[PDB]
C-alpha cells in the first residue's frame, strides 16, 4: 500500500536513536506499510552532521519498508504532507533554569512547530508529543494549529502506563500480557495517577488479588512515579529505549486499534470526568478506525479525586505559564 | 512454543542497548517464539548497576514474548543451558595498546567464555561473535570448546553485507530488497571483499548494469570498507544500531532459513575456495532447517584472488598472534 510520511523531530537525539530503526522495521504502522521518514534537527552543523550519521546507519540496515528518507533543518519542510508527526525534540532543563524558563523555551519551540504543521502537514495529521513537558507541549502545538482538528494532538502517557503494567505483573507474578483495564490519569510527570481499581487478570480483580491498599499508596504509586529517576540513577542517562517503545505503542494502538482493550492516551479534554475542556490529560480510552473514545462511567472515589486534582493542578500551573506566548 | 534461552554478553553496552529490545520484541527468533534473556556484564559494580537499569527499561516495555530475564557476573552461570549466544562484549583498543595487546586481551576473554559454553550451554548451541575482532574471537571461542560442533561458531559479516547492499541500491537506484546474490568474503574489517560479480536485480546483472569496473574498485570497495569510520566521524560514536540490526539478521536467517536466497556468514572454513580449514571466514551461504551451506562453484578471477589473499593474510596474522593462549 501507499507509503505514509512520518515526520520526527530531535532526530539525532537519544530517544530517536532507539525509535527510528523500529519505525523503519515496521513496528509502528504495520509490516505491510511502507514509510517515508522526514527527519528534523536544529540547523546547527554538529546536529545536522550527526543526523547524517544516523541516516547512514538506517540505510545500512537495508529495511524493505523504508520508501524514502530526507533530512531537514526547518519545520516548514520537515512537516510537508506529513501523515504522522512525532514531536520528540524539546529544550531540556539546564543549569540556572527556573520552571518559567523551561516553559518559555519549550513554548517557543512548539508554537513554531504547531504553526508549521498547521500550514503544511496533512489536513488530518496525527500528532504525538514525546518531548517534555509532553502534555503542555502538545497543548501549545494544538493551540497553534487552528485549522487542524484538536483531537489529533496527543501526548505520551503510554510510558507511565507500561511502567505501571510492569509493576503489577511483578507484584502479582502474572504475565504482563494478561492484565486488562489498567490505565493512567493526568500529566506525564511524577503526579501521574496509575489507577488499578478496574484492572483484571484472567477475569479476577487485581485490587482484590493484592488486597493491600497500603501497597497501592506507598509502594506502587511512588515507584511508577519516580521510575525515570531510578533509571537515571542506575544507568547515568535517561530511559531512551523504553520511551521510544511507548511512543511506538501509542501510535500503533491509535492507528491500528485496541480491539476493545483499554489503553492510556494524553488527549484534549472534552470535559469528561470534570476535566476542563482543552486540557491535554491522560484518560482511559479504546481505539478503532484511527479514532479514540474515552471510557465513560468510571467511579471516582475520594482518593482518586484528590490524585486527579493534584495532577490537574500541575497542568493548570504549566498552562498559566505559557499563555502569554499564545497571543 | 517452548522458550529459548538467549545469552548475551556486554549487556550494558551500546550495541546491546539497540539489540536487547529487538530480541525481546520477537525480531530475532520469530513472533511466536518466547525468549529468556541471560545477560552478562563484567563483575564491576558500575557495570552491574547499569545492567540493572537496562533490565528495568526492558521490563518497562511490557514485551509479551519475554518469558524471563536474569543478570549474571560469571559466564558459567550466564551460558547455562543457553540455546543461542551472542558474544558482544570484547576489549576495545585503548591508548598505548599495540595490536598484540588487543589480540591478547581479547583472547583472554574468549578462551574463558568458550570454555564456559563448552561446559554449561546447550549441546547444540548456536554462537555468533559480534565483538571485535569478530572472526578471530570466534575462532578462539571455537578452539576453546572441543565438545561442541565447530560449525556452530560464527562471526558477524552481516553488517559488511548490509552496508554493501545499501551502496548498490543507492548506485542503481533500485530497492535494496530487490538485490540478489550479493555477498562478502573474509574478515569483518576494512580488508573485507564485497563481491558484486553474481549480484542481480530483477534478473539483470548488477555488474553489467553499472558497467564501470573503476567504480567497483575505487568507490564501492573503499566506501563499504571505511563505512564504520565515516559513521564515527559524523556521529562521534560507533554504529551501534546497525551492528545490532546485522546481528539480528544473522541469527534470524541462520535459524529461520533464507529460502534459497544467498547471504554472508563468517564460518569455519571446510577448505572450500582454498581457504585453510578452521579459519573463520566470510563465505556466501544459503540456510535451511538451522543449518548453513556454502555456495559452491563460483569463479574466482585474478582480482578476486588478490582480494581474498589480503583478507586471508590478515586473519592468519591474527591467528598467529593468539595461538599461544590456546595451549
From Swiss-Prot, chains A, B:
The keyword Transcription regulation does not apply. Signal peptide: none annotated. NAD(+) binds at residues 10-16, 106, 113, 130-132. Keywords: NAD, Oxidoreductase, Tricarboxylic acid cycle. InterPro entries: L-lactate/malate_DH (IPR001557), Lactate/malate_DH_C (IPR022383), Lactate/malate_DH_N (IPR001236), Lactate_DH/Glyco_Ohase_4_C (IPR015955), Malate_DH_type2 (IPR010945), NAD(P)-bd_dom_sf (IPR036291). CDD domains: MDH_chloroplast-like (cd01338). GO terms for biological process: malate metabolic process; tricarboxylic acid cycle. The keyword Magnesium does not apply. Homodimer. Catalyzes the reversible oxidation of malate to oxaloacetate. Belongs to the LDH/MDH superfamily. MDH type 2 family. This is Malate dehydrogenase. The gene is mdh.
